Amino acid sequence: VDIAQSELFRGDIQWRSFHLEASLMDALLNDRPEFVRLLISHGLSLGHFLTPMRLAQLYSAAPSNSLIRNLLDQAPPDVGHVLRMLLGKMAPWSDLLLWALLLNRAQMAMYFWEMGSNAVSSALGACLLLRVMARLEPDAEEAARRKDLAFKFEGMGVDLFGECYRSSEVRAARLLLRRCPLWGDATCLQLAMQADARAFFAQDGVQSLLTQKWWGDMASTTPIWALVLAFFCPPLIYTRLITFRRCLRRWFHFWGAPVTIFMGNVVSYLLFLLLFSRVLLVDFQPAPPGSLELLLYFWAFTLLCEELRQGLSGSLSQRLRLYLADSWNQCDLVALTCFLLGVGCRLTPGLYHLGRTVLCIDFMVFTVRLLHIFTVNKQLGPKIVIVSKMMKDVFFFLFFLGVWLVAYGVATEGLLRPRDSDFPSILRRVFYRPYLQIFGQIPQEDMDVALMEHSNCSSEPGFWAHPPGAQAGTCVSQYANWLVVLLLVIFLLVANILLVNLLIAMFSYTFGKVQGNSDLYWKAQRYRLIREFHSRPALAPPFIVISHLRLLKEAERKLLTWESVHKENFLLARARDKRESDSERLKRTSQKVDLALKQLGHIREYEQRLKVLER
Amino acid sequence: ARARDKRESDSERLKRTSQKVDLALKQLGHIREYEQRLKVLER
Amino acid sequence: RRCLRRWFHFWGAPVTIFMGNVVSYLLFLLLFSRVLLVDFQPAPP
Ligand SMILES: [Ca+2]
Numbered sequence A: 001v002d003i004a005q006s007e008l009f010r011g012d013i014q015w016r017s018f019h020l021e022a023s024l025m026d027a028l029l030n031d032r033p034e035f036v037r038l039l040i041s042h043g044l045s046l047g048h049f050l051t052p053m054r055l056a057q058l059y060s061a062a063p064s065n066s067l068i069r070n071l072l073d074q075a076p077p078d079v080g081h082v083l084r085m086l087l088g089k090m091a092p093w094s095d096l097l098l099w100a101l102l103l104n105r106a107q108m109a110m111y112f113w114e115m116g117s118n119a120v121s122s123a124l125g126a127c128l129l130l131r132v133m134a135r136l137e138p139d140a141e142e143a144a145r146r147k148d149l150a151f152k153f154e155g156m157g158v159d160l161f162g163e164c165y166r167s168s169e170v171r172a173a174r175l176l177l178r179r180c181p182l183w184g185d186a187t188c189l190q191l192a193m194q195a196d197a198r199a200f201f202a203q204d205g206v207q208s209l210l211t212q213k214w215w216g217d218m219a220s221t222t223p224i225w226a227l228v229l230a231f232f233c234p235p236l237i238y239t240r241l242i243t244f245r246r247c248l249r250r251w252f253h254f255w256g257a258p259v260t261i262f263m264g265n266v267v268s269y270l271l272f273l274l275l276f277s278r279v280l281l282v283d284f285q286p287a288p289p290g291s292l293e294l295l296l297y298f299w300a301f302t303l304l305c306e307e308l309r310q311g312l313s314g315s316l317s318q319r320l321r322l323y324l325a326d327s328w329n330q331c332d333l334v335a336l337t338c339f340l341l342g343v344g345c346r347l348t349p350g351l352y353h354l355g356r357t358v359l360c361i362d363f364m365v366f367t368v369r370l371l372h373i374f375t376v377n378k379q380l381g382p383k384i385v386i387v388s389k390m391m392k393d394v395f396f397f398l399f400f401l402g403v404w405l406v407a408y409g410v411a412t413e414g415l416l417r418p419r420d421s422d423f424p425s426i427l428r429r430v431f432y433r434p435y436l437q438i439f440g441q442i443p444q445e446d447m448d449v450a451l452m453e454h455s456n457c458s459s460e461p462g463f464w465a466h467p468p469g470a471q472a473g474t475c476v477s478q479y480a481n482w483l484v485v486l487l488l489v490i491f492l493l494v495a496n497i498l499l500v501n502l503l504i505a506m507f508s509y510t511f512g513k514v515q516g517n518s519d520l521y522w523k524a525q526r527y528r529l530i531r532e533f534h535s536r537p538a539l540a541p542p543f544i545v546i547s548h549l550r551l552l553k554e555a556e557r558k559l560l561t562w563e564s565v566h567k568e569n570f571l572l573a574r575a576r577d578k579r580e581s582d583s584e585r586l587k588r589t590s591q592k593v594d595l596a597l598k599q600l601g602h603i604r605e606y607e608q609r610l611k612v613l614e615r
Numbered sequence B: 001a002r003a004r005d006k007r008e009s010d011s012e013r014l015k016r017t018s019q020k021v022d023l024a025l026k027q028l029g030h031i032r033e034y035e036q037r038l039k040v041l042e043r
Numbered sequence C: 001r002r003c004l005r006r007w008f009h010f011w012g013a014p015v016t017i018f019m020g021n022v023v024s025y026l027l028f029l030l031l032f033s034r035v036l037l038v039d040f041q042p043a044p045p
Helices: A002-007 A017-029 A033-041 A052-060 A067-074 A079-087 A092-103 A106-114 A119-135 A142-167 A169-177 A188-195 A198-202 A204-214 A224-232 A234-238 A246-256 A258-283 A291-312 A316-324 A327-347 A352-375 A381-389 A391-416 A423-437 A481-513 A515-534 A544-551 A554-579 A582-614 B002-007 B010-042 C002-012 C014-039
Strands: none
Touching: A002 A033, A017 A033, A017 A052, A033 A106, A052 A092, A067 A079, A067 A092, A079 A092, A079 A119, A092 A106, A092 A119, A106 A119, A106 A142, A119 A142, A119 A188, A119 A554, A142 A169, A142 A198, A142 A204, A142 A554, A169 A188, A169 A204, A169 A554, A188 A515, A198 A204, A198 A515, A204 A258, A204 A515, A224 A234, A224 A258, A234 A246, A246 A258, A258 A291, A258 A352, A258 A515, A291 A316, A291 A327, A291 A544, A316 A327, A327 A352, A352 A381, A352 A515, A381 A391, A381 A481, A381 A515, A391 A423, A391 A481, A391 C014, A423 A481, A481 A515, A582 B010, C002 C014
């Protein structure tokens, strides 16, 4: 391009818009980024240039049997349909940006986004489109390039918004994010959530906005103890303790805040568990259910209704699979399913014990759900995410332990030759007994012959000893008992020491490695938690039934200009820093010295002629 | 590509730009020596 | 033939050979344990 700009665009040649339209098409079709930037920069009217026929020609230039080419074949560009079934379907710069992203041209989309209008929205939208198409690309190498470009687009979206937030917190946080653009008629946060743009949620501006939405109409600096006191003392909200008709508006603001909904839900869930335990341990009888058991049945029924409302209103198949995609929602679904089985079996005349048994296991699932609380805390949310990533280490330890238990367990059983020889008992002595030896339960009197008396039990040849244990067998062989003791010594060394300490080292390495990513993941998923509690009914699950029964311009242009101004300021600063770098400075100073050498040589040539002429 | 990157490195660029300036100094000295003779001859 | 080629391709794949060997090895261990714990007697095998 330097040769073309220096020679053709030195200004001597008078150009025209039509003289460059053909060249502009060629640069676009042949992936020439610096040229299209140069051609447009030379006073070319893009708006009058682009035509639907030209746009159709641009999309016809998809490279051979490309992924994008397949979508047009399945789908007159008709790109609207291609956009709809990609996203989900639940200004020439924008069109050019879409074309570049579909064709996976980095610098084209790079340049087009810089000239776009809704830069923050487009950057997140570009990241979403690239990631979903990268997952859909079978090339397995172009997808890597798509993910790279998606990371780049997420990059400036963070950088541009960070600059916008620093200038005007009110303008950037409130209006720029919570707005519906033409991209998908969805807020920038929704685009980031769908794109899983974790780095976008990591910045302080997004986090500060989320906290304000989380706290509703109350000050984000309100202490936790102040909230709890107001929760248990409703009149306390009408004092100076909480900082925000007048009385009704304040009342609804406090009880409509997502944090108070979370706190109210948490207290209700704890009471439900307490009621569940009381019924299970005491009030559960073969007789027809009592008053408390009926209350528990009603309480669980509303919990089922609330979970149904979340899934139904969270495109019926599209939202249903979205609701089921959350692990916690899966935990809720299985807990309610077991509860239904327990109630059905309990009411059955001949299945009372089975009904109680499954309910006890069902209580375990409900109690485990309580871990969702720690996701709210800033210092505990990352910890839970790391715990989820430790499962790979746990599985390795379990598989290693399982092999060792089988090897040691069967050999010890084979050497002892207990005369019980019963399949339930054999399994106990092979798996159960060695397992407890890991945790300090070593029944030496059940394997060491020296600790048990000698007796005659069977007519089989050899010597036998009578263990005192109930499940240790009637009598065991004592042919080579030193080996059984030796195997116990080796088993304790491998299991109690080597394997356990190995897992600790594996946990320590994993915790340090995934610490950063988990923090990003928790920050990204923090928006999902806030959105879920934002639309939840204001009442507690026991009382949520009544809520369910009740349930059944110039400013925009000014904001966009303000965003666009900050974009050009950010770009100019980045370019200025690039030009002011040492490497660029070394590049420039080399050019000037070369120019000095050429001019010096001209002086030398001038010197000889002048001296010769003078003589 | 490896050789081009080596030549485009800052250290190599510093090496080259030092050579050209040294050439400029030698040519400048030639001009200075030419300057004295021409001025003397003119007088 | 097409059916035979597909059949041999599946059962000739190294991963399926590994999976088939793994299942066989587990069965061998299970048979080994059953003989050792129960069927092992001083009588002829
Ligand atoms: Ca839920």
